[PDB]
């Protein structure tokens with residue numbers, strides 16, 4: 001509830017739309033287990049769509065780390081330093097392409 | 104002893120979070136943390152700003168002088184920033200003054216010099232460079248990057264951009280990132296003046312207009328601790344300004360600023376910047 | 379049988395792939411929670 | 420032992436050597452292979468000449484030398500996924516490390 | 520009223536009968552759905568890995 | 571606050587144990603051994619419930635009739651009380667009749 | 668006990684984290700804190716109806732304030748801006764009262780001139796030419 005949670009005002013980062021639009025996403029960092037059942041949808045994102053995503057946004061540098069993980073993650077880093085680590089554990093391919101385009 | 108792994112694994116990771124809310128680590132830069140690739144992140148840098156840099160020229164616009172004097176002192180157990188932050192500072196000190204003079208052709212030489220002293224001073228330009236991810240692409244000696252070095256580095260990026268696309272791209276890149284920083288600001292929040300009534304007399308004598316008469320248009324609660332006055336500034340029975348204030352000398356000093364903002368074309372309802 | 383050629387591309391059937399027929403296993407209904415148990419039926 | 424099989428440019432020719440060594444009439448791409456001696460011999464040559472066996476799951480599928488010809492003019496590519504991605508035109512904002 | 524009772528006698532009986540015969544053909548066409556080899560072999564995919 | 575401050579000692583598990591590697595062998599001894607044995611002559615447990623499944627009233631009535639003659643005396647008296655309880659529960663109480 | 672609950676610290680902490688800013692024992696003890704977190708969560712969703720209502724009476728009270736500086740009343744302004752086909756809502760009209768008061772002096776003038784054009788039209792009931800600000804722009 002709003003008294004239990006903080007608040008803020010509506011703001012862009014550096015007046016994001018005035019002169020030019022700067023994409024605020026800086027990095028994306030996937031960690032996908034190769035032999036691992038939870039990353040089975042995220043393995044197909046790295047297969048199918050991580051090349052296609054990396055040409056719609058050239059200002060975002062993408063990392064696919066591919067280690068022994070139990071819960072695959074995407075760590076979305078922004079230009080102002082905020083870090084959103086969302087978990088793509090046992091998601092489909094469709095639920096990740098909406099997850100990553102939302103970040 | 105209840106058996107099982109998963110609650111003890113959750114609780115171990117939720118005590119590490121409490122170890123960081125009691126003992127947080129000192130800041131390290133993004134370079135010496137995982138997931139980093141410097142020739143990647145410099146390419147991806149320019150694509151964000153929609154600018155075509157030349158990567159030999161942009162890479163050396165991050166190599167500061169202090170970074171170099173640590174590498175050679177560590178080599179007992181590269182070209183600098185300086186050439187490119189001289190062409191990028193002299194240009195944005197001169198490409199900024201051309202925009203502020205075309206938009207406000209009535210501001211004096213003393214004010215526009217102080218407007219460009221604010222847009223190219225350390226406190227706006229190190230808010231621009233920190234949110235454009237310059238602070239993560241610098242090579243420097245210490246961390247967090249001090250604003251002597253970061254104000255220097257950001258203009259070497261403007262220096263690199265000038266030799267990669269010329270002024271007819273760089274006059275945009277200053278208009279979109281430094282000129283936008285004055286939006287929603289008052290004039291004397293940048294150009295801070297002492298005694299605006301002195302500065303208002305001489306501007307009025309310059310335009311061959313007679314003296315302003317301080318005069319009390321409206322007031323309220325003159326014998327309380329919360330008064331309001333409005334002091335109107337009449338130049339031969341026409342008012343050029345009026346301003347409010349807690350006492351009379353506050354309202355006369357502020358109506359002197361209200362006159363200067365109307366004289367210079369820096370009012371609140373003035374025409375916005377065309378982008 | 380075209381279905382056997384589909385078995386070539388799929389990974390090998392282990393004991394970690396098995397699944398009953400849909401409808402063969404009903405879910406056991408046990409009295410915990412707001413709907414199933416307050417007076418528990 | 421590598422499973423990387425490339426169909427050579429001359430597979431249509433080397434097979435006509437190998438039907439003729441297993442037999443020899445015309446229309447040599449439509450012989451029924453219902454003899455097992457005529458199926459074992461033709462398929463034990465083509466493995467030892469090429470290094471690419473017929474799997475047991477595809478063995479009953481090839482009843483014609485039509486059906487043996489097109490098993491050998493497909494390629495089998497056997498690479499890791501790190502080899503498959505890094506040799507597949509990654510855009511320069513994409514880095515794939517592989518801690519394995 | 521535009522017509523009387525004698526004029527609207529049976530005037531929608533061809534559509535009213537046809538509307539129920541679609542309600543009746545909706546109700547007499549209940550059956551279990553077709554069951555495929557597609558949804559059964561697709562559970563083998565839960566152990567798909569990389570090489 | 572009953573949650574452990576250290577994570578427990580690790581569970582190693584030998585998947586190629588002799589019990590696990592040969593699990594299942596001779597479960598099909600009847601249908602391809604000319605039916606000389608049943609698969610329930612492989613099950614090893616209490617003598618009264620070899621090849622036989624029942625609920626708790628069927629189990630204690632069967633354990634009494636088969637092994638009650640050599641049961642311990644304070645352990646037999648618990649069995650007759652348990653049969654007398656599960657008779658009263660299963661025949662007199664419940665939601666469904 | 669075959670299997671007992673180990674995750675119970677994390678179920679307490681989903682309800683106690685929402686109660687951390689409360690008074691007394693309803694931030695610490697879970698049995699009291701679960702009845703207040705529920706009651707706080709009931710009030711939060713029922714206040715999506717009263718945020719919308721309490722904003723509008725605040726807009727109406729700020730419009731009644733500013734249309735009385737110009738002599739009108741609230742119903743004489745709002746009903747008459749409709750007859751001029753001016754479909755500005757109450758949120759914008761309270762924004763024009765505060766932030767652009769020369770325009771609110773124009774809308775109070777438009778609403779009053781249409782108000783005088785309605786008295787002067789409905790005196791001679793029957794065929795009389797409409798006022799300038801009484802013509803409707805019909806759309807088809």
Ligand SMILES: [Mg+2]
Pocket residue numbers: none
């Ligand atoms: Mg209860």
